Design an enzyme around this catalytic site. Structure first.
Site, PDB file in Angstrom:
ATOM      1  N   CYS A   1       0.209  56.177  88.609  1.00  0.00           N
ATOM      2  CA  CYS A   1       0.726  55.773  87.315  1.00  0.00           C
ATOM      3  C   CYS A   1       1.058  54.307  87.499  1.00  0.00           C
ATOM      4  O   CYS A   1       0.167  53.461  87.521  1.00  0.00           O
ATOM      5  CB  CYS A   1       1.939  56.606  86.820  1.00  0.00           C
ATOM      6  SG  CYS A   1       2.977  57.586  87.991  1.00  0.00           S
TER       7      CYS A   1
HETATM    8  C1  LIG Z   1       4.093  56.510  88.839  1.00  0.00           C
HETATM    9  C2  LIG Z   1       5.497  56.490  88.466  1.00  0.00           C
HETATM   10  S1  LIG Z   1       5.774  56.260  87.070  1.00  0.00           S
HETATM   11  O1  LIG Z   1       5.343  57.454  86.380  1.00  0.00           O
HETATM   12  O2  LIG Z   1       4.967  55.159  86.610  1.00  0.00           O
HETATM   13  O3  LIG Z   1       7.335  56.014  86.727  1.00  0.00           O
HETATM   14  C3  LIG Z   1       8.153  54.969  87.146  1.00  0.00           C
HETATM   15  C4  LIG Z   1       9.004  55.086  88.281  1.00  0.00           C
HETATM   16  C5  LIG Z   1       9.836  53.990  88.661  1.00  0.00           C
HETATM   17  C6  LIG Z   1       9.829  52.778  87.921  1.00  0.00           C
HETATM   18  C7  LIG Z   1       8.967  52.688  86.790  1.00  0.00           C
HETATM   19  C8  LIG Z   1       8.135  53.773  86.402  1.00  0.00           C
END
Ligand SMILES: */C=C\S(=O)(=O)Oc1ccccc1
Length: 282
Positions: A217
Protein backbone atom coordinates in the site's frame (compact mmCIF):
# COMPACT_ATOMS: atom_id res chain seq x y z
CA UNK A 1 -16.51 -19.85 21.41
CA UNK A 2 -13.85 -20.11 18.67
CA UNK A 3 -14.83 -16.70 17.39
CA UNK A 4 -16.29 -15.44 20.64
CA UNK A 5 -15.22 -11.99 21.83
CA UNK A 6 -13.06 -13.68 24.48
CA UNK A 7 -11.36 -15.58 21.67
CA UNK A 8 -10.86 -12.48 19.55
CA UNK A 9 -9.61 -10.67 22.66
CA UNK A 10 -6.93 -13.27 23.36
CA UNK A 11 -5.76 -13.02 19.77
CA UNK A 12 -5.55 -9.24 19.66
CA UNK A 13 -3.93 -9.62 23.07
CA UNK A 14 -1.10 -11.90 21.95
CA UNK A 15 -0.86 -9.85 18.79
CA UNK A 16 -0.49 -6.64 20.80
CA UNK A 17 2.39 -7.95 22.90
CA UNK A 18 4.02 -9.15 19.70
CA UNK A 19 3.53 -5.81 17.96
CA UNK A 20 5.19 -4.25 21.03
CA UNK A 21 8.15 -6.60 21.35
CA UNK A 22 8.80 -6.21 17.62
CA UNK A 23 8.81 -2.41 17.73
CA UNK A 24 12.09 -1.27 16.16
CA UNK A 25 14.69 0.18 18.52
CA UNK A 26 17.47 2.60 17.52
CA UNK A 27 19.87 0.66 15.33
CA UNK A 28 17.81 -2.49 15.93
CA UNK A 29 19.82 -5.55 14.79
CA UNK A 30 16.56 -7.19 13.70
CA UNK A 31 15.95 -4.51 11.08
CA UNK A 32 17.67 -3.18 7.98
CA UNK A 33 19.34 0.20 8.50
CA UNK A 34 19.64 3.29 6.30
CA UNK A 35 23.13 3.43 4.82
CA UNK A 36 24.88 6.60 5.93
CA UNK A 37 22.32 9.16 4.85
CA UNK A 38 19.54 8.42 2.39
CA UNK A 39 16.15 7.72 3.97
CA UNK A 40 15.30 4.05 3.64
CA UNK A 41 11.92 3.67 5.37
CA UNK A 42 9.05 5.74 4.06
CA UNK A 43 7.95 5.86 7.69
CA UNK A 44 10.71 5.74 10.30
CA UNK A 45 8.68 3.60 12.69
CA UNK A 46 7.62 1.04 10.09
CA UNK A 47 10.88 -0.71 9.35
CA UNK A 48 12.07 -3.79 7.48
CA UNK A 49 13.11 -7.18 8.83
CA UNK A 50 16.77 -7.58 7.92
CA UNK A 51 16.58 -11.36 8.02
CA UNK A 52 14.05 -11.45 5.18
CA UNK A 53 15.00 -8.24 3.41
CA UNK A 54 14.87 -8.58 -0.38
CA UNK A 55 17.25 -5.72 -1.19
CA UNK A 56 19.71 -3.89 1.05
CA UNK A 57 18.14 -0.65 -0.10
CA UNK A 58 14.39 -1.27 -0.08
CA UNK A 59 11.78 -1.51 2.62
CA UNK A 60 10.62 -4.91 1.37
CA UNK A 61 10.65 -8.46 2.77
CA UNK A 62 10.20 -12.09 1.81
CA UNK A 63 7.13 -13.29 3.71
CA UNK A 64 5.90 -16.84 3.95
CA UNK A 65 2.61 -17.49 5.65
CA UNK A 66 2.36 -21.25 5.75
CA UNK A 67 3.16 -22.37 2.24
CA UNK A 68 2.24 -19.05 0.75
CA UNK A 69 5.28 -16.95 -0.04
CA UNK A 70 5.14 -13.39 -1.29
CA UNK A 71 6.80 -10.05 -0.91
CA UNK A 72 5.42 -7.13 1.01
CA UNK A 73 7.02 -3.72 0.68
CA UNK A 74 6.35 -0.05 1.21
CA UNK A 75 5.61 2.29 -1.63
CA UNK A 76 8.98 2.97 -3.31
CA UNK A 77 10.59 6.38 -2.74
CA UNK A 78 11.81 8.45 -5.69
CA UNK A 79 15.26 7.02 -5.11
CA UNK A 80 14.16 3.45 -4.51
CA UNK A 81 12.44 3.35 -7.93
CA UNK A 82 15.41 1.93 -9.87
CA UNK A 83 16.18 -0.74 -7.27
CA UNK A 84 12.43 -1.27 -6.99
CA UNK A 85 12.13 -1.97 -10.69
CA UNK A 86 15.26 -4.10 -10.47
CA UNK A 87 13.65 -6.27 -7.83
CA UNK A 88 10.27 -6.76 -9.50
CA UNK A 89 12.23 -7.77 -12.57
CA UNK A 90 14.55 -10.26 -10.96
CA UNK A 91 11.67 -11.66 -8.93
CA UNK A 92 10.10 -12.41 -12.29
CA UNK A 93 7.13 -10.82 -10.56
CA UNK A 94 3.96 -12.87 -11.40
CA UNK A 95 1.69 -10.11 -10.16
CA UNK A 96 2.05 -6.75 -8.48
CA UNK A 97 -0.71 -5.83 -6.06
CA UNK A 98 -0.80 -2.10 -5.31
CA UNK A 99 -3.40 -1.23 -2.70
CA UNK A 100 -2.52 2.42 -2.24
CA UNK A 101 -5.19 4.90 -3.40
CA UNK A 102 -5.05 7.13 -6.48
CA UNK A 103 -5.72 9.93 -4.03
CA UNK A 104 -2.60 9.02 -2.06
CA UNK A 105 -0.56 8.84 -5.21
CA UNK A 106 -1.76 12.12 -6.73
CA UNK A 107 -0.82 13.73 -3.44
CA UNK A 108 2.68 15.00 -4.21
CA UNK A 109 3.05 15.68 -0.49
CA UNK A 110 3.00 11.89 -0.12
CA UNK A 111 6.10 11.17 -2.21
CA UNK A 112 4.52 8.23 -4.06
CA UNK A 113 5.63 8.32 -7.73
CA UNK A 114 3.05 7.11 -10.25
CA UNK A 115 5.67 4.55 -11.07
CA UNK A 116 3.27 2.00 -12.48
CA UNK A 117 0.43 3.86 -14.20
CA UNK A 118 2.56 6.03 -16.48
CA UNK A 119 5.51 5.19 -18.72
CA UNK A 120 8.92 6.60 -17.84
CA UNK A 121 12.66 6.11 -17.49
CA UNK A 122 14.40 5.74 -14.16
CA UNK A 123 18.02 5.67 -15.15
CA UNK A 124 19.24 2.74 -17.24
CA UNK A 125 15.70 1.40 -16.87
CA UNK A 126 12.75 2.40 -19.06
CA UNK A 127 9.21 1.50 -18.06
CA UNK A 128 6.09 1.11 -20.17
CA UNK A 129 2.68 1.10 -18.54
CA UNK A 130 0.01 -0.67 -20.56
CA UNK A 131 -3.49 -0.42 -19.10
CA UNK A 132 -5.22 -3.75 -19.59
CA UNK A 133 -8.52 -4.47 -17.83
CA UNK A 134 -10.70 -3.00 -15.09
CA UNK A 135 -12.68 -5.21 -12.75
CA UNK A 136 -15.12 -4.26 -10.04
CA UNK A 137 -14.73 -6.10 -6.75
CA UNK A 138 -17.94 -5.05 -5.03
CA UNK A 139 -19.02 -2.18 -2.82
CA UNK A 140 -17.83 -0.11 -5.74
CA UNK A 141 -14.19 -1.04 -5.16
CA UNK A 142 -12.19 -1.33 -8.39
CA UNK A 143 -9.21 -3.26 -9.65
CA UNK A 144 -7.33 -1.36 -12.35
CA UNK A 145 -4.89 -3.59 -14.16
CA UNK A 146 -1.83 -2.73 -16.19
CA UNK A 147 1.08 -4.66 -17.65
CA UNK A 148 4.38 -3.21 -16.47
CA UNK A 149 7.22 -3.67 -18.92
CA UNK A 150 10.69 -3.19 -17.46
CA UNK A 151 13.40 -2.89 -20.11
CA UNK A 152 17.12 -2.56 -19.48
CA UNK A 153 20.29 -2.92 -21.51
CA UNK A 154 21.96 -6.28 -20.99
CA UNK A 155 19.02 -7.25 -18.82
CA UNK A 156 16.02 -9.37 -19.82
CA UNK A 157 12.80 -7.56 -20.70
CA UNK A 158 10.14 -8.39 -18.13
CA UNK A 159 6.50 -7.42 -18.24
CA UNK A 160 4.75 -7.59 -14.90
CA UNK A 161 0.99 -7.95 -14.51
CA UNK A 162 -0.28 -5.18 -12.29
CA UNK A 163 -3.41 -5.15 -10.14
CA UNK A 164 -4.24 -1.72 -8.73
CA UNK A 165 -7.01 -0.95 -6.28
CA UNK A 166 -7.68 2.78 -6.48
CA UNK A 167 -10.57 3.25 -4.07
CA UNK A 168 -9.21 1.36 -1.03
CA UNK A 169 -8.70 4.17 1.49
CA UNK A 170 -5.67 3.62 3.74
CA UNK A 171 -6.13 2.69 7.41
CA UNK A 172 -9.39 0.87 6.64
CA UNK A 173 -10.73 -2.60 5.81
CA UNK A 174 -12.88 -3.55 2.84
CA UNK A 175 -15.81 -5.98 2.72
CA UNK A 176 -14.56 -9.49 3.46
CA UNK A 177 -16.52 -10.16 0.30
CA UNK A 178 -14.37 -7.67 -1.59
CA UNK A 179 -11.19 -8.55 0.26
CA UNK A 180 -11.91 -12.06 -0.99
CA UNK A 181 -12.68 -11.22 -4.61
CA UNK A 182 -9.33 -9.42 -4.73
CA UNK A 183 -7.23 -12.25 -3.32
CA UNK A 184 -8.62 -14.49 -6.06
CA UNK A 185 -7.90 -12.03 -8.87
CA UNK A 186 -4.43 -11.37 -7.47
CA UNK A 187 -3.91 -15.12 -7.35
CA UNK A 188 -5.61 -15.56 -10.71
CA UNK A 189 -3.22 -13.11 -12.32
CA UNK A 190 -0.12 -14.47 -10.61
CA UNK A 191 -1.22 -17.88 -11.79
CA UNK A 192 -1.44 -16.94 -15.47
CA UNK A 193 1.95 -15.25 -15.63
CA UNK A 194 3.62 -17.87 -13.44
CA UNK A 195 2.36 -20.61 -15.78
CA UNK A 196 3.87 -18.63 -18.67
CA UNK A 197 7.38 -18.68 -17.22
CA UNK A 198 6.84 -22.37 -16.46
CA UNK A 199 5.87 -22.97 -20.06
CA UNK A 200 8.71 -20.82 -21.38
CA UNK A 201 10.81 -23.25 -19.39
CA UNK A 202 11.90 -20.41 -17.11
CA UNK A 203 14.43 -21.13 -14.36
CA UNK A 204 13.01 -18.91 -11.62
CA UNK A 205 10.82 -21.94 -10.93
CA UNK A 206 13.58 -23.77 -9.10
CA UNK A 207 14.49 -20.64 -7.15
CA UNK A 208 12.06 -20.24 -4.29
CA UNK A 209 12.73 -16.58 -3.52
CA UNK A 210 11.47 -15.82 -7.04
CA UNK A 211 8.16 -15.59 -8.90
CA UNK A 212 6.80 -13.97 -5.77
CA UNK A 213 3.73 -11.78 -5.94
CA UNK A 214 4.53 -8.34 -4.59
CA UNK A 215 2.04 -6.38 -2.55
CA UNK A 216 2.13 -2.95 -0.98
CA UNK A 217 0.00 0.00 0.00
CA UNK A 218 1.98 2.95 1.31
CA UNK A 219 3.79 1.57 4.36
CA UNK A 220 3.18 -1.98 3.16
CA UNK A 221 1.67 -3.20 6.44
CA UNK A 222 -2.02 -2.42 6.66
CA UNK A 223 -3.95 -2.96 3.45
CA UNK A 224 -1.06 -5.10 2.32
CA UNK A 225 -1.21 -7.42 5.30
CA UNK A 226 -4.96 -7.78 4.79
CA UNK A 227 -4.52 -9.03 1.22
CA UNK A 228 -1.73 -11.39 2.22
CA UNK A 229 -3.79 -12.91 5.00
CA UNK A 230 -6.54 -13.15 2.43
CA UNK A 231 -4.26 -14.75 -0.13
CA UNK A 232 -3.01 -17.08 2.57
CA UNK A 233 -6.33 -18.69 3.49
CA UNK A 234 -6.91 -18.80 -0.24
CA UNK A 235 -3.98 -21.22 -0.62
CA UNK A 236 -5.47 -24.74 -0.38
CA UNK A 237 -2.40 -25.95 1.53
CA UNK A 238 -2.52 -23.72 4.58
CA UNK A 239 -4.97 -26.05 6.26
CA UNK A 240 -4.80 -25.57 10.04
CA UNK A 241 -2.79 -22.36 9.75
CA UNK A 242 -4.21 -20.13 12.47
CA UNK A 243 -4.96 -16.44 12.29
CA UNK A 244 -2.52 -16.17 15.19
CA UNK A 245 0.15 -17.65 12.92
CA UNK A 246 -0.66 -15.49 9.90
CA UNK A 247 -0.17 -12.28 11.86
CA UNK A 248 2.63 -13.50 14.12
CA UNK A 249 4.49 -14.77 11.06
CA UNK A 250 4.14 -11.69 8.87
CA UNK A 251 5.26 -9.56 11.79
CA UNK A 252 8.37 -11.61 12.43
CA UNK A 253 9.08 -11.57 8.74
CA UNK A 254 8.49 -7.84 8.10
CA UNK A 255 7.60 -5.84 11.21
CA UNK A 256 5.26 -5.95 14.22
CA UNK A 257 2.87 -3.55 12.53
CA UNK A 258 1.66 -6.17 10.05
CA UNK A 259 -2.12 -6.12 9.96
CA UNK A 260 -1.96 -2.54 11.18
CA UNK A 261 -5.60 -1.73 11.98
CA UNK A 262 -8.22 -3.79 13.80
CA UNK A 263 -10.91 -3.74 11.14
CA UNK A 264 -8.22 -5.40 9.07
CA UNK A 265 -7.69 -8.19 11.57
CA UNK A 266 -11.46 -8.50 11.76
CA UNK A 267 -11.79 -9.28 8.05
CA UNK A 268 -9.15 -11.99 8.23
CA UNK A 269 -10.94 -13.17 11.37
CA UNK A 270 -14.17 -13.23 9.38
CA UNK A 271 -12.68 -14.91 6.30
CA UNK A 272 -11.06 -17.41 8.64
CA UNK A 273 -14.31 -18.06 10.45
CA UNK A 274 -16.28 -19.08 7.39
CA UNK A 275 -13.48 -21.54 6.74
CA UNK A 276 -13.62 -22.95 10.22
CA UNK A 277 -9.98 -21.93 10.55
CA UNK A 278 -8.69 -21.54 14.11
CA UNK A 279 -8.07 -18.03 15.40
CA UNK A 280 -5.78 -18.68 18.34
CA UNK A 281 -3.13 -21.34 18.88
CA UNK A 282 -3.70 -24.09 21.43
C1 LIG B 1 0.47 -0.10 3.74
C2 LIG B 1 0.01 0.61 4.92
S1 LIG B 1 -1.03 1.58 4.71
O1 LIG B 1 -2.22 0.81 4.41
O2 LIG B 1 -0.71 2.38 3.56
O3 LIG B 1 -1.35 2.51 5.99
C3 LIG B 1 -0.51 3.43 6.62
C4 LIG B 1 0.26 3.10 7.76
C5 LIG B 1 1.09 4.08 8.37
C6 LIG B 1 1.16 5.40 7.85
C7 LIG B 1 0.38 5.71 6.70
C8 LIG B 1 -0.46 4.74 6.09
Amino acid sequence: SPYGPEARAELSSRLTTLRNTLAPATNDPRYLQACGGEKLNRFRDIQCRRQTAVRADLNANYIQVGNTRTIACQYPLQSQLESHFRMLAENRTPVLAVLASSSEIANQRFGMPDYFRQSGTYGSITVESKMTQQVGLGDGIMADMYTLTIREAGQKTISVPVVHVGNWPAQTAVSSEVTKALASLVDQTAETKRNMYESKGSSAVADDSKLRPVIHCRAGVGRTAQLIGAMCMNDSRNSQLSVEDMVSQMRVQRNGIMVQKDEQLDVLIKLAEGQGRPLLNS
